[PDB]
């Protein structure tokens, strides 16, 4: 059972790594979206001024 379980854990680690990578990706994407939105708001403020 030793080598079997170690191989299983070996696979599961890289799986976890990939998942965390995808998490970081969309976190960056959401930040970008927020920046774009506040930029549009600032532009409308300029038009109002």
């Amino acid at each position: 059972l030793l080598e079997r379980l170690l191989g299983e854990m070996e696979l599961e680690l890289i799986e976890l790594r990939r998942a965390l990578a995808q998490t970081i990706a969309t976190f960056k994407s959401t930040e970008r979206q927020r920046d774009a939105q506040q930029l549009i708001a600032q532009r409308w403020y300029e038009k109002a001024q």
Binding site: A25, S29, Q33
Partner: protein, 49 residues
Amino acid sequence: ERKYLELKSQKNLYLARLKSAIAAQKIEEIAGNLDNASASSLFERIETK
């Protein structure tokens, strides 16, 4: 014989309008204008990857 050419005189216009309408959504799919972030293809999947 009159009515036939009458219809033939508009077949072409209809085909042209339809092809234009198709092409509209065709390239609206790729690289969405992002007026809304509801869905964009082939420029976000690439960016996210």
